[PDB]
Design a protein around this ligand. Sequence first.
Ligand SMILES: [Zn+2]
Length: 195
Amino acid sequence: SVPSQKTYQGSYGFRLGFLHSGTAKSVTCTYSPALNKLFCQLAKTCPVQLWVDSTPPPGTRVRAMAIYKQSQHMTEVVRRCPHHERCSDSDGLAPPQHLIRVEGNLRAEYLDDRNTFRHSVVVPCEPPEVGSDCTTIHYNYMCYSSCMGGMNRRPILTIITLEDSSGNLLGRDSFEVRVCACPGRDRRTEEENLR
Ligand SMILES: [Zn+2]
C-alpha cells in the first residue's frame, strides 16, 4: 500500500544527480542538496541526471512515481487536482490525471497500476552519449504543491527506480519536490529555516 523509498544503489551503482541552477528569483528549477529537495515551476523542465558505475543490461528502464512524504497521507494516490486534470494540456501521451510527465521522449510509457491505482512514467535507460558521463531525463510536474483538492499544500517525494525488463528492482533513489511560483525564493527560505 506504500512504495518503498529506501535508497539502493544496487549492482550498477545507481544514483541521481542535479544541476547547480542557483536561487535567483527568475530560476525555474533548482535543487537543494541540504534539503534533498527540488523546487520547480509548474510544467517547466526538471533535468534529473542518472549516474551508474557500470552499464545495466539492455531492456533496463527508469520509472518515476510520486508519493506523499507525510506518513499519514502516504496511502493516498498523488494525482493532479480537479482543475488541472481537466485543463486539456495533454501532450498526446500522458494521461491528464498524471502529475509527472517525461518531456521529449516518445518511448515514455504511463502506467495506471491496476492494483494500487498509483501513477508512474517509465522510459528505457539510455547510455550516456559520446563525451557524456551520465544521461538526463527531463521531467515536468503538472500541478502546484498548493493545488486545492490535489496535493493541497502536502509535500511529496519523487521516487526514481531503475528496473529490469520484468519491472524488478535494480536501484532506487528519491527527492522531495515542491512545485511553486518562485523556486529560488522558496529554496532560500527553506534552507534558511533549516540553518
Ligand atoms: Zn493543480
